[PDB]
Design a protein around this ligand. Structure first.
Ligand SMILES: CNC(=O)c1cnc(Nc2ccccc2C)c(NC(=O)c2cc(F)cc(Br)c2)c1
Lengths: 272, 1005
């Protein structure tokens, strides 16, 4: 019935660290530290409620405990377990959850085999090597992902420019036929095939060039189609590497548990 | 590495001297015209219609003068070339062709929009196509802010116009501190006035001794009084010529374009406040006012074309909030590595969920469809106005692993105060690098314009009619309704909470204790940010009651009001109160100082039209100094599609009303474009070529006339007061870094350039994210300003640094300075392959022979103490000798902060033995002398001096969270400064904490 050995007391843990432990958790998940003020015998309880991490200060006086001006309990373990049994709406109706889910310090200690020191000096260096390699691949993916992303929009605006040029050459064809039809028809009955072939020679050269830019557009739309697909492939590959990267980063992290078995960081200093 | 234009033609850097242009006539004839690269369109059109006579149907062509050219730019714009003076090669043509049309519409408007487009980097016509009514309303509704500013600065012409272009560069207070005052000769300053005489622009000087607080006109009075000494003038004849000169001349700083146009005390002008601080001689040039106003050409402001041409309340809806998630699209996920996907959602007010999150069911990757109505634990009337929907698509993968795939945020109310209804579809954004939270409530609200990106479809409840947020009328009455449903020891605790920093822990007992005494809080207005975080924003009762308190809140000063513009205070009433504090307490000096953060928090704004943007835009158009950097900070982020529209519209309005300065900005933009294109060529094409082959491409490319005409004779973006004249091509070069930045050197064309600096050299770097150095160098300037005002004469060197785009910008060169590694190499090896530790001290002695030796040691010890404290606090301590520099003067300063932040992925700060030699003047056991004794006393005083202003810095960094800098993605990143400043400990505990770090900084002691 001691506080130091209790499940939900972690000790010198930082606020940013508990925020990293109640992330997306359920209402009622709770955890206590010694206050960030670093003052002896002064604590803070933080519990999940409404998607928020709500902190409360555990006051201490005359050896008693509590978190309001009227102060009662003998130990924090009595203060907590009381609110594990029934709701803390007694303190404040604005929040009415029980201290349902504790998060403990030395559960999730997922090292199972014979605890030879090589579980650190060997399997830690292994996971950390596996972590920095996969972390280097994800950084490489994100580099060519952003490179491909910008080359795509460069092409999307270039084909959009081709669209405007082709729109302007097509209206040129539709105005060539509008203003040349009845000059062709007039030249036809005057027997002036010479002038008819000047107009046709120029018209042929018009839609000869429009064919070149039309071909240049599809040749770019082809490069775009194929780079847009390799872009989606880079995306799904990153999405596959992210959860793995997090999994073996947490494994590398908790394999410092068995470094903490020695406490003094000699067994990682050797790898330094 | 995209670009508004990589060259004069698509995929081509420069046009050959002669190229063929396809000309499309108003008859269907196509004419190939061979024309010079530099041919003006006037020459093209004339020679085209001269050649057209050789082609059929010339009879149908009107007169040459009745047509203009139209073509397609590399931005995909069909541009009408009204300004026929431009060279063919400047058009940014996609393909070399020209379509002949009859001009239509306002010529002057079309020529002006093209110039704006070149300035902001995108065509203005793209805004015309936007469906969004918020966009079109913004374009029209801030034109009155433009009219206000133009009318205000054209009021008392030409003076008011000169005050806009050449605003006084002054400190925020005339009260100079005693350590500055003591360098005055019995409260006076000696100044030299210069005059130019015509026959050969020969010049003469007049030395004066005057009270430090003389106004510029009084300086002109003492100068004419000193020259009329022997003219035997009566008291009234002296007045008449004093009056003549006071009203006919003004004073200018020799060497740059700064002027003394307003009657601040002379010592309040920054140039002279530093001449006193540095003990240098202020050199001023007397100049005719009619000459200054001559270089201020009149500039109009014309309203553009677009400028001119039932519902129930939220508090009646008796139902809880629910939102329908339909389906997704374009989700990129490996179907065999990922088990299932789902949509995560939350209702947020700032960064605090108004209610618990809710998720859709999990669904196979191959069929992203849900059709689920998600129910939220919040009563619709309890919604605050600034409520937002934050969502994302997540994957799950044997302990589970959840990861976000794409995110998106939505304002539950739009800019018209209406509640969204009906089916909605928004394209999501990529999850930023390093973010692992399933949601991103700090990201911008809006749909991603990029195509083939995951599109999520939703539907909101329709309540038979349009729903609107209640007017302020009923909100106050609901407060009168709920309020119906002194003390001592509590007084000291409330004040005890105002002291605590913006990021300090605030427990439940403390915040509802504030909410209880919320009415006593207006006696300590500094508590407002803490009280606002205490309001339960999912209760319309409390919010309404809070609205009434902020409506009558006492103004807090800007350093505190800026916190209320960060991402934790999204309510429009709170943010409106913060703006009103700035526009009545924020000087243009400290506006320009904090401009980086003020532009940045525009990203947090819920809508385009808001009180903050109108304030910044107002000030940017009434002060061209802050309007310069206002433009460049907005321009530097145009590439970022999350803000390219907000900033683009904002830049459009500025460029449309900034006046003749747009012409100058376009010369800067074109100069940068030429430099960024040459570096791109050096980085993409001839990266494999040798460094001398690259040098010859540089020396040859810079000699081209079109390049020199563009890079010679324009204002420095680092400081528009500095003119950049001719290039000293002899001194230009590529540098050693892999990105090969350009070392550029210009002549200073000022008439008296020799009195300041005769040549000005800047580093242009393309490929490095420079905004980390901007924020660091800015922060260093803040700390130096704090120390100077406290009396600590610790000299820092926040050299100029400006980001102009995606990983590209300018850096100011510090003359007569070397790295500590460079200085070690000027000496010899003392130990076994070990540089001599005394080499730094010996080099400094050689540069400061004689009586000036003590000054150099004092300057080194002071500048060193400054950077030791600064770098420790900011976690920038463990620097390499090549990243620390020192002037011949003895001034020490650090460089390349972005390199350090990147190289990250152990010592509190660099206090090497070499520095201790200099500090102790070359003594044995230098850590036990009395020079070192008072050196660490400077460090102690400087540390607790910054801790005494810890709130300002924490707020400055907090406002940068939405920037996109990976160093600033969450408030947890800012916690580091709370550790170094030891804000959860007392002064003596923080002092002792820093003292232990200093003992460890000297690597043992
Ligand atoms: C070996 N170094 C570290 O471990 C380290 C850890 N946390 C940090 N956070 C931190 C601290 C104070 C202020 C702001 C931040 C973001 C920093 N400092 C920066 O990242 C930083 C500092 C700037 F001045 C400017 C820019 Br931009 C970024 C360093």
């Amino acid at each position: 019935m001691s506080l130091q050995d209790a499940e939900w007391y972690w000790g010198d843990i930082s606020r940013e660290e508990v925020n990293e432990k109640l992330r997306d958790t359920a209402d009622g998940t709770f955890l206590v530290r010694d206050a960030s003020t670093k003052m002896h015998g002064d604590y803070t309880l933080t519990l999940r409620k409404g998607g928020n991490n709500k902190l409360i200060k555990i006051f201490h006086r005359d050896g008693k405990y509590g978190f309001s001006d009227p102060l009662t309990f003998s130990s924090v373990v009595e203060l907590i377990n009381h609110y594990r049994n029934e709701s803390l709406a007694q303190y404040n109706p604005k929040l009415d959850v029980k201290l349902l889910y504790p998060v403990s310090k030395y559960q999730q200690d997922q090292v199972v085999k014979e605890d030879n020191i090589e579980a650190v000096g060997k399997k830690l260096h292994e996971y950390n090597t596996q972590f920095q390699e996969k972390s280097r691949e994800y950084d490489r993916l994100y580099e060519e992902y952003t490179r491909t992303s910008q080359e795509i929009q460069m092409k999307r605006t270039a084909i959009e420019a081709f669209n405007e040029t082709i729109k302007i050459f097509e209206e040129q064809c539709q105005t060539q036929e509008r203003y040349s039809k009845e000059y062709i028809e007039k030249f036809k009955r005057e027997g002036n095939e010479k002038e008819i072939q000047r107009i046709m020679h120029n018209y042929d050269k018009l839609k000869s060039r429009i064919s070149e830019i039309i071909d240049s557009r599809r040749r770019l739309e082809e490069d775009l189609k194929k780079q847009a697909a390799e872009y989606r492939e880079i995306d799904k590959r990153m999405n596959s590497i992210k959860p793995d990267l997090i999994q073996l980063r947490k494994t590398r992290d908790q394999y410092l548990m068995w470094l903490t078995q020695k406490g003094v960081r000699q067994k990682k200093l050797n790898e330094w | 590495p995209p670009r508004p234009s990589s060259g004069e033609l698509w995929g081509i850097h420069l046009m050959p001297p002669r190229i063929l242009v396809e000309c499309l006539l108003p008859n269907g004839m196509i004419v190939t015209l061979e024309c010079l690269r530099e041919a003006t369109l006037i020459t093209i059109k004339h020679e085209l219609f001269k050649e057209a006579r050789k082609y059929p149907l010339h009879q149908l062509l009107q007169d040459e003068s009745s047509y203009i050219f139209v073509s397609v730019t590399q931005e995909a714009e069909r541009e009408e070339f009204f300004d026929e003076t431009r060279r063919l090669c400047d058009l940014r043509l996609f393909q070399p062709f020209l379509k002949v049309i009859e001009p239509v519409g306002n010529r002057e408007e079309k020529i002006l929009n093209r110039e704006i487009g070149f300035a902001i980097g995108m065509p203005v016509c793209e805004f015309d196509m936007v469906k969004d009514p918020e966009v079109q309303d913004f374009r029209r509704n801030i034109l009155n802010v433009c009219k206000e500013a133009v009318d205000l600065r054209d009021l008392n012409s030409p003076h008011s116009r000169a005050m806009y272009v050449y605003p006084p560069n002054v400190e925020s207070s005339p009260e100079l501190p005693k350590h500055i005052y003591n360098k005055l000769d019995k409260g006076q300053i000696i100044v030299v006035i210069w005059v130019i005489v015509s026959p050969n622009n020969d010049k003469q000087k007049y030395t004066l001794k005057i009270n430090h607080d003389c106004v510029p006109e009084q300086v002109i009075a003492e100068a004419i009084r000193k020259k009329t000494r022997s003219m035997l003038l009566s008291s009234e004849q002296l007045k008449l010529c004093v009056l003549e000169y006071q009203g006919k001349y003004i004073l200018k700083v020799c060497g740059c374009d700064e002027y003394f146009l307003e009657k601040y005390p002379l010592s309040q002008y920054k140039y002279i406040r530093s001449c006193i601080m540095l003990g240098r001689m202020p050199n001023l040039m007397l100049m005719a006012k009619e000459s200054l106003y001559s270089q201020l050409p009149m500039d109009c402001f014309t309203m553009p074309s677009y400028s001119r041409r039932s519902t129930k309340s939220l508090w009646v809806i008796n139902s809880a909030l629910r939102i329908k998630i339909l389906c997704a699209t374009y989700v990129n996920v490996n179907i065999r590595d990922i088990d299932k996907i789902y949509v995560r959602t939350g209702i947020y007010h700032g960064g605090e969920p108004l209610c618990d999150n809710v998720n859709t069911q999990r669904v196979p990757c191959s069929n992203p469809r849900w059709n689920e109505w998600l129910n939220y634990d919040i009563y619709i009337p309890d919604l605050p106005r600034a409520a937002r929907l934050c969502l994302s698509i997540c994957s799950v993968k044997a302990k589970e692993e959840h990861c976000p795939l794409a995110w998106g945020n939505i304002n539950l109310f739009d800019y018209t105060d209406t509640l969204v209804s009906g089916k909605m579809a928004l394209n999501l954004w990529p999850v930023p690098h390093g973010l692992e939270d399933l949601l991103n409530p700090i990201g911008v609200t809006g749909s991603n314009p990029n195509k083939e990106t995951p599109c999520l479809e939703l539907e909101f409840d329709w309540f038979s009619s349009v729903v609107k947020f209640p007017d302020m009328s009923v909100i106050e009455e609901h407060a009168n309704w709920s309020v119906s449903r002194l003390r001592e020891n509590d007084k000291e605790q409330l004040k005890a909470i105002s002291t605590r920093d913006p990021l300090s822990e605030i427990t439940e007992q403390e915040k509802d204790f504030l909410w209880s005494h919320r009415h006593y809080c207006v006696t300590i207005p500094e508590i407002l940010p803490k009280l606002l975080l205490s309001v339960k924003w999912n209760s319309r009762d409390e919010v309404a009651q809070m609205y009434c308190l902020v409506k009558d809140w006492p103004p807090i000063k800007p350093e505190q009001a800026m916190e209320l513009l960060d991402c934790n205070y999204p309510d429009p009433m709170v943010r409106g109160f913060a703006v009103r504090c700035l526009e009545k307490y924020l000087t243009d000096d400290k506006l320009s100082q904090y401009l980086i953060q003020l532009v940045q928090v525009l990203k947090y704004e819920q809508y385009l039209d808001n009180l903050l943007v109108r304030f910044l835009l107002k000030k940017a158009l009434t002060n061209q100094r802050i309007g310069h950097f206002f433009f460049w900070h907005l321009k530097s982020e145009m590439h970022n599609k999350t803000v390219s529209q907000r900033f683009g519209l904002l830049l459009e309005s500025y460029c449309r009303a900034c006046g003749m300065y747009l012409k100058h900005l376009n010369r800067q933009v074109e100069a940068m474009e030429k430099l960024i294109n040459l570096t791109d060529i050096l980085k993409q094409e001839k990266k494999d070529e040798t460094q001398k082959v690259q040098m010859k491409f540089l020396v040859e490319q810079m000699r081209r006339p079109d390049f020199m005409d563009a890079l010679q004779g324009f204002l420095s973006p680092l400081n528009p007061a500095h003119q950049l004249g001719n290039l000293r091509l002899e001194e230009c070069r590529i540098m050693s870094s892999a990105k090969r930045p350009l070392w550029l050197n210009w002549e200073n064309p000022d008439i008296m350039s020799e009195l300041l600096f005769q040549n000005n050299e800047i580093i242009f770097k393309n490929g490095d994210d420079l905004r980390q150095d901007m924020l660091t160098l800015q922060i260093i300037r803040i700390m130096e300003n704090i120390w100077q005002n406290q009396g600590l004469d610790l000299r820092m060197l926040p050299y100029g640094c400006l980001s102009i785009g995606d990983c590209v910008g300018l850096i100011e060169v510090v003359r007569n300075s070397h790295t500590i590694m460079q200085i070690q190499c000027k000496g010899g090896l003392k130990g076994a392959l070990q540089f001599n530790s005394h080499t730094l001290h010996q080099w400094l002695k050689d540069k400061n022979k004689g009586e000036i030796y003590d000054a150099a040691i004092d300057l080194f010890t002071r500048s060193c103490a400054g950077y030791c404290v600064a770098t420790f606090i900011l976690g920038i301590g463990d620097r390499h000798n090549s990243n620390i520099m020192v002037k011949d003067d003895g001034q020490l300063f650090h460089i390349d902060f972005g390199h350090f932040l990147d190289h990250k992925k152990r010592v509190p700060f660099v206090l090497t033995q070499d520095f201790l030699i200099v500090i102790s003047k070359g003594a044995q056991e230098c850590t036990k002398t009395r020079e070192f004794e008072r050196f660490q006393e400077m460090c102690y005083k400087a540390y607790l001096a910054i801790r005494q202003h810890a709130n300002l810095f924490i707020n400055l960094f907090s406002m940068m969270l939405g920037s996109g800098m990976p160093e600033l993605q969450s408030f947890d990143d800012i916690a580091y400064i709370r550790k170094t400043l030891a804000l959860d400990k007392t002064e003596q505990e923080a002092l002792e904490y820093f003292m232990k770090q200093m003992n460890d900084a000297r690597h043992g002691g």
